[PDB]
């Protein structure tokens, strides 16, 4: 049991704010991590902090802006320590169909769900490496393999992800850092919009599940404490989904 | 943490006496599941049970039997009740390389790696349909994906497994079944005695990893009760490979 | 034809195809007669068969066998080899799906599709691999499936055989190649046959599936011509154990 | 039995100055489609029309200004007219090490790898759509699953190019256009000089295929005409690895 803690360690989950992120962040602080919330929005971080309990700290930060990134995590390992435990949760899918990409929504779509996780990570693996034990976990997407309708340059990054998490763990898994990627179905977020307000996309979703059902906020708790934890030590470099079955069918 | 538990859960665990289902069956009985273990010999099982601890039975029982397995299937449901929790550990590898395949060394793998599994579930199953809840939990391995020499049987029955744990997502997981496989990497067991023996294969099997270690007994703990718990609810039709990221290089 | 069209010649090769009587194996033992094989055909019925040699012209002989009697495959494996010498090119795509669900299989319908789908095709490439071997150089192909990857319903023995297939074909590679044999799985899609009547003859079913693809239908019998031949010729001769989908990108999706 | 023909055809080929895409370029102008032929260097570029024979067209372009690619695209239908087939051919590898990533390496990767072909793609799609058929190959690598030194950035570009391929084929497939991408193990070029410079490390690679030898320049001719020709009508989105068996192992 002891194995699933994560107490006394240290967090950061970017995309706090909403969404998947701020249920792991959520989820994290009840656990008795320390963690460090990252989002835009003061005030969207402020409400988080109201919810979340434990013992948090909000970074109001745009991560589109990649040169103040090196500056972003000097902020992140100032309230509480370097962190242990580093969760992507931020991410963007502009739903723009192939033959309506833009410049703009092609490059804001590999840098919050690629290159800001890379070089975020990047930053932050010293103070791990350090203390020879680190949690990376990366969000992968039925779109790592399946490709859905204006998903062009979403699958383009999140095909990237799991590349990118292998290669992570190459690189740092000799030094006591896995990295891993969760890989939810489809949940009600900002970024599923669409496939939740047509009821008749929402259930066609869940039918090709095989549980038959959509995801719901608690169901990704499990799998992310496993992968913050002691209990996933020789697990490596995997994409974990989290989809009631859907890429089983 | 109670995500995690097992308590008051009953489990079989077929090839109880030894490698990783001996360790499986330990690890459930020690964090309160009762545990009914199936393995040939009643002494390997005796000396498993006093390891064990808690609660638990042994069936001495020869899983190459089919026409017998619905009355092991009945035996196993006499000392605790129906399982909510199947875990498929029982397992062979002849290492015969394909120009000296025998008939009866393809059928015994086919037998015990690929059939029992299918068949003892579907003798077990009604019993977690009856009270919505289930976990089966298959072996897959690294031949799953990626063929060693003296594979090519056992290579087949665990390209198999995997598709049979996601059809038995499909068939059951709508009833509150989840199946997924777990894949261990190299573990010194039984099956793996010539990757051991040798020391130079044993490192190079280990420099094959991220991490850079082969696996050790512990490391399967956590992975296998997050399958066998309520943490993984949403998880099913799933490999979940845990071999320090042998399969990401 | 440019020169580097000779690259998938298969003139002049010994094929043996199972399944030969109907569906994708007729289809295949058709292609591989039509363009230049030798092609040994072998399935359950003489007079199936004969419409078959019928269909094909060419050069071909029909050998009638139960491929659900392993005891005999060493054998066929003789009787494959005497019409035209040892086949340099083999294509296991007999097969067999009871639809049985899960808890509806009986051991006999889990029985015969491992067999037909998974043990046959062992058995009789480790029969027929030596002549390949003298000549260093040989072809098999293998037929995966969608169940290789994604269960469908009343799938799960097929399921287990497919996916069998795939790492079966993998270690077909491992153990042949270095002498010369490739071993590919094709991996066609919905096309309509014997093992899909039910996936057909419902059309809002059918609709469904071809709405899945990429493309937008179902396979046609001639969409796994040049699959098939890339896969048998000297095209293919870096590509081993690989499982090649030809499904209008159902995977894609 | 022709199927594989690309005579009549006009197809367009990135990176034809050296490495795959110059064979690639040959074998097309060779076959009888007209070919375009697009690399930094008019001089290796006039080197390769000099040696390829057939109808050729060299347009010298630095590939990794994305800003002029769409000016690049009305250059390449200017010759021939629009091209039927266009192969992704261009590419680098840093070979940065994680820790050593710079933000100028990681961009470049994602630049030529990623998103040029993207880009580049899509100002080439209408003119066959108008016609109702086409075909775009893209290059996968081993480092699409398998994480190698210095790879990272690689490794998360080419996994992209994989899931990007995918949605090329989701996008596009209904309008006549197939999208797949070839996966070649190692051979002889630019990309793969350190893994060939140290024999040791050439014969290693080697024997991790099942052929036991690595790629010979003619040995991705007859994929690469399967993926560009009729042959090829009912295969999309596909990842066709040419690797003597790399993969299986």
């Given at each position: 049991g002891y194995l699933f803690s994560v107490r006394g360690r240290?967090?950061?989950?970017?995309?706090?704010?909403?969404?998947?992120?701020?249920?792991?962040?959520?989820?994290?602080?009840?656990?008795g991590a320390?963690?460090?919330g990252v989002a835009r929005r003061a005030?969207?971080?402020?409400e988080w902090q109201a919810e979340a309990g434990g013992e948090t700290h909000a970074i109001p930060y745009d991560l589109s802006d990649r040169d103040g990134l090196?500056?972003?995590?000097?902020?992140?390992?100032?309230?509480?320590?370097?962190?242990?435990?580093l969760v992507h949760a931020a991410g963007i899918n502009t739903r723009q169909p192939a033959d309506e990409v833009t410049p703009e929504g092609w490059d804001?779509?590999?840098?919050?769900?690629?290159?800001?996780?890379?070089?975020?990570?990047?930053?932050?693996?010293?103070?791990?490496k350090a203390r020879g034990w680190g949690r990376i976990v990366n969000f992968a997407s039925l779109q790592t393999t399946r490709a859905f309708p204006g998903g062009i340059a979403y699958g383009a990054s999140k095909g990237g992800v799991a590349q990118m998490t292998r290669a992570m763990a190459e690189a740092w898994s000799p030094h006591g850092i896995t990295a891993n990627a969760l890989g939810p179905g489809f949940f009600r977020t900002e970024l599923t919009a669409p496939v939740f307000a047509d009821p008749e996309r929402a259930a066609r979703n869940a039918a090709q599940t095989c549980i038959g059902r959509n995801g719901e906020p608690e169901d990704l708790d499990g799998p992310l404490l496993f992968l913050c934890s002691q209990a996933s030590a020789y697990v490596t470099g995997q994409v974990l989904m989290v989809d009631g079955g859907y890429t089983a069918k």
């Open positions: 240290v967090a950061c989950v970017t995309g706090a704010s909403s969404g998947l992120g701020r249920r792991a962040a959520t989820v994290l602080a009840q656990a320390q963690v460090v005030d969207a971080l402020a090196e500056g972003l995590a000097r902020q992140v390992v100032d309230p509480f320590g370097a962190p242990d435990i804001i779509t590999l840098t919050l769900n690629l290159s800001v996780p890379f070089f975020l990570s990047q930053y932050l693996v010293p103070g791990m």
